[PDB]
Amino acid sequence: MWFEILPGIAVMAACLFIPGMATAHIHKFTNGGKEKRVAHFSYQWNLMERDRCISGVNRYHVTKGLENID
Amino acid sequence: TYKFVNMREPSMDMKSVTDRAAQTLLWTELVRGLGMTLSYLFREPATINYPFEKGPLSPRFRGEHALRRYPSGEERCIACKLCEAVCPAQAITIEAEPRADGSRRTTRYDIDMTKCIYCGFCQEACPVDAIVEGPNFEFSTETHEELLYNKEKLLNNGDKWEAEIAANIQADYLYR
Amino acid sequence: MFMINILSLIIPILLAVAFLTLVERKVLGYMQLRKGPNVVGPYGLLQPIADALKLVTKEPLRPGTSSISMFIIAPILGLSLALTMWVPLPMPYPLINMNLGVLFMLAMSSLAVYSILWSGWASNSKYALIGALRAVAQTISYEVTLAIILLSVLLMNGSYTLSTLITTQEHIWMIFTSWPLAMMWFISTLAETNRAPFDLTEGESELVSGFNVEYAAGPFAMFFMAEYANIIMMNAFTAILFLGASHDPHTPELYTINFVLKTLALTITFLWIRASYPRFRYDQLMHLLWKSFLPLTLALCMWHISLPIMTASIPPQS
Amino acid sequence: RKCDPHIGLLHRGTEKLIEYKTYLQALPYFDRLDYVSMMCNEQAYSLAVEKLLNIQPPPRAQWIRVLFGEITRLLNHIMAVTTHALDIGAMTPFFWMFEEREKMFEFYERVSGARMHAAYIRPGGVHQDLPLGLLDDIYEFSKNFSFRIDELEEMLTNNRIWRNRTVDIGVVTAEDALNYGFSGVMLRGSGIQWDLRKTQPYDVYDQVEFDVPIGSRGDCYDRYLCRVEEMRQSLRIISQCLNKMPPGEIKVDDAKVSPPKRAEMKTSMESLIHHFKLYTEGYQVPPGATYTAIEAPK
Amino acid sequence: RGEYVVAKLDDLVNWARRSSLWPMTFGLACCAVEMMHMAAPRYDMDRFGVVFRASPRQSDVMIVAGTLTNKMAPALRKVYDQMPEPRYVVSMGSCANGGGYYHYSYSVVRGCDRIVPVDIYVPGCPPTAEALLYGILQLQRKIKREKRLRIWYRR
Amino acid sequence: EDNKQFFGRHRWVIYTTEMNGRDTFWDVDGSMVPPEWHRWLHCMTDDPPTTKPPTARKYIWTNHKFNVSGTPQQYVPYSTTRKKIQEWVPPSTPYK
Amino acid sequence: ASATRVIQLLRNWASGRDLQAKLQLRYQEISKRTQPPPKLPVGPSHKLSNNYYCT
Ligand SMILES: COC1=C(OC)C(=O)C(C/C=C(\C)CC/C=C(\C)CC/C=C(/C)CC/C=C(/C)CC/C=C(\C)CC/C=C(\C)CC/C=C(\C)CC/C=C(\C)CC/C=C(\C)CCC=C(C)C)=C(C)C1=O
């Protein structure tokens, strides 16, 4: 009956779920938890580049709060 | 008595034209077609699980041929050649000869199952119900020669499907 | 961590089309009261693998009148174009955050038709050239409506970035503001991918072939997997563009689950219409777009240029 | 510009092979001419042989003929429309109504023995009487067939794609159809009110009431509608045949034309001799020429 | 072991072959009507993996359904020679097997065998749609007992 | 059998794992049905052989054989009649 | 293998008619396949007298 159709969907739905989960988790994993910063314009990229220089370890996502200055 | 199948003229009032226009833009008969395909999706499929669920037949079914024998054991065919004479495709070849004991039967009774049309005329013509078409229809083979049955293979069929052919003619002899 | 990301997209994509061929027959059969494949594995869960493995072990052969080079590259064109097109799709966070993602998918999708006639022309067959010439004017005429429909809808976006659709239809589904354009968008997607109110590209009834004329195990598999992948996306693109979903920035899995469900529902509808309508004749499918879709297309365009201005609802460019 | 239909790709020598066989032996050939009109084909040949023999079948045999003749008209019409939908492109109504065709195939097998080539209708009546309880199944199947017809026609009759694929296509005139030798639906589909079931009634077709669906435009769409309406009209003819089936024998009570009953063939001298001669030589028919015709489902 | 490895590999290929047969319909005569009933939902040929596919370049088995007339005999050979050839031929009905009813005609070849090699023979006139399903099932068994790799390993 | 199922699936057979020295665990055949049960299974009658066994006679086989095509047990057609012309036997005597 | 009422309402509404009344599958209304033996009648000429073939 029609419920026999569902296994056809399930093995596809899980397969289609992987790219959404993999990309979301890889970005978080490769950027220290926070989402990958998006730079649609040069001003966003300028913040990112200044983040890379400021962090010292040349990592844009590695962020320094108030404790960097004193 | 005749009926005009397509002589419907649509109305020109403001209501009817809008419905046709609504049908045109907002595809409705297409949705009605879609809506009914959904109805058949939820229904009960009619597929039968072959070969676990074989199809329904009738006692009159015509399949693989077989020569039957009397309850005593002696064959029913007395070589009258009625089946050979009435075979529309001439698939029957018969050769007879006086047997050692007297009453004589065929020495060659070959049925060409690749020339047979399975019309059943042989089983009607037979005055002793010797040649019959059994219920089997699953005797497909890999080689053409295996189809060309002779007396021995047909007699084997009679000794194999007898438990079924006996019941079929038992249920159908009164109709004939 | 990018090769892992790419291979976390290519393998799920090819497996999605892989079992879409099973949910095709198992849905097509049930809609025509059949049962579909349920022999190879439980409920047919292994039939496409049996299909695929055969289609990479049965003798391939180039036609005697073929053009070898163009005959071979056309499957390359079809498959690579289909895969590369999924790239900017914004499943929570898109794999490649293109600034002009919409224009990108339009450009490459307009390229997936070079495969169909390069295959047709190189095959040097009468049915091949007919099917090739049927398809090209089919797609490009359906492409004019494809471009304008996208533009009219995206005028409320303020940009061509695919990620912004998540923000645009945050509270209200986009279809509730552009449903007239949604209908022709769905029809055009049925037409660019050559499903079967306009499957004349294959034209099996009148042209026996045309998607893959003499194409064999390998190349036939490509030209199939290159168009069934387009089936899944062109509904994923429809899902992302019209039927938005809630996206919590902390738990993207809810959006991916919702996004997948909309693609699955849309894909079923692609299979659903496929077994509920006859075949459009060539002049009809061209007449439908050049004479009925386009006049409504331009009119609703002019509406959507003016609409934000009259209501003072110009979306933010950024 | 021109359509030259090269035929002869299946020119089996039927007309020459018939000469070498007897009249009974030539019966299965007509089942194998039109793969779908089985009893209708045998009915035409049976009428021709009976007309030469100046012999009529018993009333029960005639009613079974028209009953299975109309069932056959359902069979051809079911495939004619569905394969027309297949070639057009609509593949779904193919499978629904070919489930019913299997249901009618059971009736063919339950009466004659074979599912397609019944070899049932024979000169002088029919081979043997209906198996007990067949009429009930015929009534059960016909009860729901009205719905199944509505299932077919609802998805195509009003379907914009379907009409555009058939409306104003293959239009023929009235006199053009008459001169070209067109018959059956093609005259009916283009205004010509002609149907052998009413103008020249054969068997007991003068007792059943039905309506012939005359078409108006004459294009593909009108004829397809005529086919569907002819499908519905056969149900009334089926209904009348089921409700008015008379008692009696199923073959002409004359051993020199129809074979005697098996009970008598094993009991009496004359039956055995007639059975022997009828199945070896056959029934000699008076020297003459005839041209019978029936409203075949095509 | 090398023989064991070739044994499993052969089974994998043979499973992929028998589980996907795509007939190229040569519908000729009343034998074709019964075959379509096999495609009808009563028997559902599709459910066995076997689904009808045109374009003999994309088909595996021929199902000769009907009489083979001498006029079209070149067509049968040509469409047989164009199949990517892991390929098999199924003959349906007495006419296709050896001529059947028209065995003695002037324009019917006495069997489709004289034009093409023939795998499993399906007898009948017509063979019921269930009988053909048994025939296709027999071909699947025949494909199962193919030792192509074992022979290659022992060449 | 299950009468609630629609006519066609109300009866079914689960084939045996082994018959006549041929494993059929994954190799079930449609001809593996004995004739007595073949009648009931095909809906040709409603009387299972347990309730109504067919009449027993000597010539009826005691072991059903499936399709023996392919296996080295096939049926090879051959002439069932003797010779017709008797060749003259030459005399072995050295003559003269 | 008669389905749940939820499907029946959906199945009926999607088609637009009561499908449970007339169904495409024969459940039990069919005639039993084991019918009592019949008694066929005889033809009009089955007479012991005044039935000469010349007439
Ligand atoms: C008219 O209308 C019509 C249609 O519709 C409108 C139709 O639909 C159809 C179609 C017909 C039907 C649906 C009917 C039924 C028919 C079928 C179902 C046919 C089935 C066909 C198939 C092709 C089967 C598909 C099924 C499956 C299961 C496919 C499964 C897929 C696979 C096995 C492959 C999956 C992918 C894999 C394994 C990828 C692996 C990748 C890797 C390992 C990585 C590769 C990459 C790298 C390593 C990158 C790194 C390398 C580098 C950098 C190299 C660098 C090199 C240098 C030199 C520099 C027809 C005919 C039609 O008529």
Ligand code: SF4
């Ligand atoms: S059923 Fe076959 S063997 Fe018997 S008479 Fe007809 S053609 Fe000849």
Ligand code: SF4
């Ligand atoms: S009809 Fe019967 S008895 Fe006469 S030859 Fe044929 S098998 Fe023998």
Ligand code: SF4
């Ligand atoms: S064998 Fe019989 S059914 Fe098949 S094509 Fe020949 S005459 Fe027709």
